[model samples]
Target: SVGLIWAQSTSGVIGRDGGIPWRLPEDLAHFKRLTMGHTVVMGRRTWDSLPAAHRPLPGRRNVVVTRQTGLVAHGAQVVGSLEQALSPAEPDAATWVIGGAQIYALALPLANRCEVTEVDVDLPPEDEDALAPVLDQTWAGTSGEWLVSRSGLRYRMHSYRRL
Candidate 1:
């Protein structure tokens, strides 16, 4: 029922500071394919990183976990904790955890499925400020191959389920 989704650089980098540090509309298109009509759970920083116009993520449900109270997040509702995000969904429901350094790791234990876009480009060490959990043996996806994006960047949409 739990799933995690992210687009990472070849070096496993997903974000730097408050930005993704890369642009790939294709990766986003792929994300929509997987997360459409599902519940998306994200940390406040990830929520803020989303463009103002796409805050609620169009057809999906957005749940934001934040520390501070009284903050107003339009379209996306602010939540008390990550646990609260999963509570409303059914056991067989597809709930996707969508980002931030801590959010990914926190959701990992409960996640049964992971969809990652392994983008071809690698940034310098300094720019690789944030990384996702290592793609270890516990999950599958070593067989997926890189495909060229329309923008010419090659990446793999690696999918993994608990092994």
Candidate 2:
């Protein structure tokens, strides 16, 4: 039931300085609809990055994985591990692993599908830890035609299915 989703630069950089460095409202909207009404499992740090007003990510079930025991996560569930976070996924409902790389890798093997956006711009690898995980041979990918964001960035979306 796990599906992984993220937007990365050509170098697979998903984040920088604790947040997604680039602004692509287009990709954000795509994810808004793609994961609508679905359960989203994310890392605690990823959850922390969400703006206060969007905390439960409106209209979705938010399951945040954290090693810490004291998190309240108001209106969201705090699970101690990725396995526990995904344990309650609905069989018929969509369940996506929205990532911060580490969380993505944790669920990569369990994910049946993946949705990724590749932005045209590349950045210096100052922080290597926030990059996207490598997609190995277990999945087959196909990409959509490139789209230009209103922000003026060129990007393309990729969808992968388990092989």
Candidate 3:
């Protein structure tokens, strides 16, 4: 079953510092265009971060993977494990792995396609551990097409056929 995995992290202190360093509304608009119809996967924290009014990103299936049982959100299917969250998706449906670091790690190995936005902007030096792991050199070698760049941030959208 092929699934699309979408991942993105904001540059600078997007939430905490009260400002995002990059000014790329166009980039985000582009992203919304790409993911509008897909099923989006996300970790608990990421799910929580969404505003209550926008709990489920519109026009997409929302699958929130969380360890907490019975935690519920409007418009989201709360799933207990990675396998369960992914299980409901149709085999041919695009399943996006949206994130909060941990969820991306779990989904990367299983995803068939990846959409990554590489921001040239740097994170706070004090928060390196919080930025999350990236696809290593070995994984990058065989991944899909690396395309799309904007506002000084270069990105590559890649696809990996599951072996």
Candidate 4:
């Protein structure tokens, strides 16, 4: 099954002042382990948001979903739509939908699992641009549960599976 992993701070903020605010090395380590060998999909803007070294997540099949024509990246495949990207899924092959907001909203309904790092604090307004939309409850349906860490920061790492 596919998984979604995001590095967010204790304020539900994925990016603060144009970058991630959290310092949880363990959470990121977990993310890398889960997505290492899978296909990762993200939006064009998201492709541009990362540092040059991290643009196309290493050691994985990187598929960028973009409407623009002729936009190419080394080691990354460009697809016009999410459906096109998922059309060729093989058995036991999971495609991770990484994000920028719009791509998450478009692909969340079709995801098998969501690995969300739910922050504990309320994000500042200035950081609202980095926030993803509130997915309707109906979209999530009956799914998975949350795993809260006993040590370090108080946050819930939620995994919502499609029913």
Candidate 5:
């Protein structure tokens, strides 16, 4: 199954300065649980923004999309396009489009499911660096329902299935 996964603020902000704006450990754990052993497709910026020690996250097949030919991205399979990154994940593999705004926009149409951690805060415009336009325009209101709600962090895990 092809899916999109990420955490976002209520204002649709996903990141700031090439990094996530929040430090919710529970959400991090949630991400790991869902993506373990899955094939993760991401853009070069997303790959770059990952913690240096954890670039090419363990326990998953990492595929990075970039135009730079012959790029070496730690332990990831580098591909020139999103299609190249996705082509091999079929039949039985679960592919997760894990982000950077551009990659999310490109993969949304191909995604069958979206696993979102919806944070209940409104991010300030200055802190809102990256926007998930596809999620804002299409999936925010109609496609998803809450599957799990967590305290402390005040986030809800929503799962949306494309119709």
Candidate 6:
């Protein structure tokens, strides 16, 4: 099944200057726990934002969608389109559409679920890079719980299932 996973600010901001604006280790752990065994599809910029040592996240298949011809992603399977990335994913394996804006917009319709971490701060205009897509009306929140970071920022993990 196709799923989406992302952390966004309360204002719906998902990225800033090519990276996530906040640093929450709890969220990081939450993400890793949920997506560890799934195939992760992400855009070129998102792939670039990953730390060098973890370019292709271990234990997960990395499929990077990019239009850049001759792109060389050291440890990833590169595709020209989102469809191409999803096409070859193992049928029984979960596929997570991880992102950098455009990929999330394109993949949302195909996703059966979304795991989102909502941070309690709004990003400043200059730091904003991407916004999360509007969830369809048919999508219903299946789970939600607040999370208080060690740094004192409040956040929540919300899981939505498409009806």
Give Cα-based local distance difference scores for all models: 0.83, 0.88, 0.62, 0.69, 0.82, 0.87
Locate the minimum summed-lDDT window of 10 residues in model 3. 12-21
Model 2: worst 10 consecutive residues (lDDT sum) = 85-94
Error of 1 at 129 (Å): 2.1
Where's the lowest-lDDT run of ten residues in candidate 5? 140-149
Clashes of 5: 0
Tens digits of per-residue lDDT, candidate 6, 1-163, equal 8999999888888888878888888888898999897788999999999997788998888999999979999889999999898899455378999897999999998889999898888676564479898887979885566778999888889899998
The best-first sequence of candidates by TM-score reads 2, 6, 1, 5, 4, 3
Question: Per-residue lDDT of 66-107 in model 1, one digit per residue for the tens?
Answer: 888787888887878888888874443688999977899888
Candidate 5's error at 95, in angstroms?
A: 0.4
Rank the candidate models, highest lDDT first.
2, 6, 1, 5, 4, 3
The clash number for model 6 is 0
Q: Model 6 clash pairs?
A: none
* TM-score of model number 4: 0.77
In model 5, which residue pairs have backbone atoms overlapping below 3 Å? none
**Cα lDDT tens digits for candidate 2, 49-111:** 998888889999889999888998898988899989777844436799998888998899888
TM-score of each: 0.91, 0.95, 0.71, 0.77, 0.86, 0.93
**C-alpha lDDT of candidate 2 relative to the true structure:** 0.88
Scored against the true structure, residue 143 in model 5 reaches a CA lDDT of 32
Candidate 1 TM-score to native: 0.91
lDDT of 4 by residue, 8-36 (tens): 55444576555665556556667788888
Number of the candidate with higher TM-score, 2 or 4 = 2
